């Protein structure tokens, strides 16, 4: 499967 | 709270699209939740075998294979389904 992404301040 | 992705700012409950570094498309959501959290999912799309290029549902492209020219089309249908046909007049 293709990768997704996640993020947030302080990453 | 807000989300910051690629110099763009989104509101909580906002949805948007984003191109992964690898080239495939993502559908995303801004949660914020105190830290500006966001998530992105791989959209249903097609990936060309030879070129490794990504095409979106409804997209059409051409390619030369063994000197033969084809018109290709991304159907998706939940499995990134795509088919090609030889050029004809
Ligand atoms: C992407 O779209 C699907 C529906 O096609 C949805 O269920 C999913 O929550 C979305 N992903 C994100 C992180 O927004």
- A-chain residue closest to B26, CA distance: A4
- How close does chain B come to A8, measured CA to CA in Å? 4
Distance, in Å, from the CA atom of B46 to the CA atom of B43, rounded to the nearest integer, reads: 9
> Which resolution in angstroms does this entry have?
2.6
Do A8 and B18 lie within an 8 Å CB cutoff?
Answer: no
Contact residues on chain B for A8, CB-CB shorter than 8 A:
3, 35-38
In chain B, where the domains are located:
1-43, 44-89
* Class of the domain covering B44-89: mainly beta
- How close does chain B come to A10, measured CA to CA in Å? 8
What does DSSP assign to residue B2? E
B71 touches B62 (CB < 8 A): yes
* Class of the domain covering B1-43: mainly beta
A3 touches B20 (CB < 8 A): yes
DSSP code per residue over B21-74:
TTS-EEEEEEEETTTTEEEEEE-SEEE-TTT--EEETT-EEEEEETTEEEEEEE
């Amino acid at each position: 499967g293709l990768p997704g992404m996640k993020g947030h301040r302080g990453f | 709270d807000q989300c910051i992705v690629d110099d763009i700012t989104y509101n909580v409950q906002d949805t948007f699209h984003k191109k992964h570094e690898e080239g495939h498309m993502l559908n995303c959501t801004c949660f914020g939740q105190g830290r500006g959290r966001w998530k992105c999912d791989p959209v249903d799309q097609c990936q060309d075998s030879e070129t490794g290029t990504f095409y979106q549902i409804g997209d059409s492209w051409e390619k030369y294979v063994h000197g033969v020219r084809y018109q290709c089309y991304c159907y998706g249908r939940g499995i990134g389904e795509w088919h090609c046909q030889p050029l004809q007049t």
